[PDB]
Amino acid sequence: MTKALFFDIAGTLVSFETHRIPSSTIEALEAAHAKGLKIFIATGRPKAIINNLSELQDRNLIDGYITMNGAYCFVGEEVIYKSAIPQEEVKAMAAFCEKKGVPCIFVEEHNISVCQPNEMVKKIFYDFLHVNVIPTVSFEEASNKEVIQMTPFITEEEEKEVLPSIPTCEIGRWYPAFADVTAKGDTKQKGIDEIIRHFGIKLEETMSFGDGGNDISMLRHAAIGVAMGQAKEDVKAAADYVTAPIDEDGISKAMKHFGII
Ligand SMILES: [Mg+2]
């Protein structure tokens, strides 16, 4: 039976329409916490911009975090796994974005920066997602840092164009306007493996919840994958069960369906 739950944040815990966590989600996570389920966040965001989970954090309901798509995982104050991107590939992405005239965010362990932020950053990251303004640094400076994740605001055509230049990185999206790039193998599936290794939980005892392309590997990898009802068709197809949309009690209904609560 299920022992560990892995939740994506945007479109799975937090509504893109209200920017809040549905009340029935908070009630379901309280009831699962008291039943002894372990509750984990699994997000493409780095810790520095997780600014929308205080309801669950102040209720002490989260047992650990998979951040940066699995490239930085921690339980309490303890880092259990982290990675960095090959410097050649950080430099190639900085050069490609600078040439194309698009912004890119560069995330280090303890710093986050943005290069040449433009309308796509202001429109999507700040006006819509409500992320705090990230400090600007030049592409040259960023190209030289030890980077755990890059977030280029590139289209799918542009991503296919830069691909040859980031030969070993993973790339995926939780929103259509930008993509997150991590080192080889660092996906939320790797995150689930590191968190259950720490707790002695088997893969056959996990359940994941997601709405986006960057959740597909953890929807297929967990023993039971739950897609949100408003997710695109390929995310639904990677799941074992499609629940109601997020703002129609999707999380609570899924957890009640399985008997988690
Ligand atoms: Mg999402």
Chosen domain end from 153, 184, 215: 184
The Å distance, Cα 229 to ligand 1 centre, comes to: 12
Q: What's the 47 CA to ligand 1 centre distance in angstroms?
A: 15
Q: In whole angstroms, give the CA distance from residue 195 to residue 246.
A: 25
**Ligand 1 centroid – CA 228 distance (Å):** 9
Domain with residue 150: its CATH number is 3.30.1240.10
Q: How far is the CA of 72 from the centre of ligand 1 (A)?
A: 17
Of 184, 200, 216, at which residue does a domain stop? 184
Centre of ligand 1 to C-alpha 231, Å, is 9
> For residue 87, how far is its CA from the centre of ligand 1 (angstroms)?
28
Domain housing 190: 1-83+185-261
Shared-domain flag, residues 98 and 174: yes
Same domain, 157 and 89: yes
**What resolution in angstroms does the PDB record give?**
1.5
231: tokens are 């997710």
Q: Residue 78's CB: how many other CB atoms inside 10 A? A: 9
How many domains is the chain built from? 2
CATH of residue 79's domain is 3.40.50.1000
Kindly give the distance from the C-alpha atom of residue 256 to the centroid of ligand 1, in angstroms, as a whole number: 21
Q: Name the residue with tokens 């193998």.
A: 185
- Shared domain for 14 and 55, answered yes or no, is yes
Residues contacting residue 148 through CB under 8 Å, at least 6 positions apart: 46, 68, 71, 72, 82, 83, 84, 85, 107, 108, 109, 182
Ligand 1 midpoint to CA 138 (Å): 29
**Helix (H) or strand (E) segment spanning residue 242:** strand 241-242
Q: Are residues 101 and 130 in the same domain?
A: yes
Residues 11 and 75 in one domain: yes
135 and 192 inside one domain: no
Which amino acid makes up residue 57? Answer: Q
Using the 3D structure, point to which of 184, 206, 240 is the last residue of a domain: 184
Both 88 and 169 in one domain: the answer is yes
Displacement of CA 142 from its chain's centroid (Å): 22
Q: Are residues 75 and 93 in the same domain?
A: no
Distance 139 CA to ligand 1 centre (A): 28
77 and 120, same domain (yes or no): no
Distance 215 CA to ligand 1 centre (A): 7
Distance 140 CA to ligand 1 centre (A): 31
Q: Are residues 19 and 75 in the same domain?
A: yes
**211 alpha carbon – ligand 1 mean position (Å):** 5
Answer yes or no: do 88 and 174 share one domain: yes
In this structure, are 73 and 89 located in the same domain? Answer: no
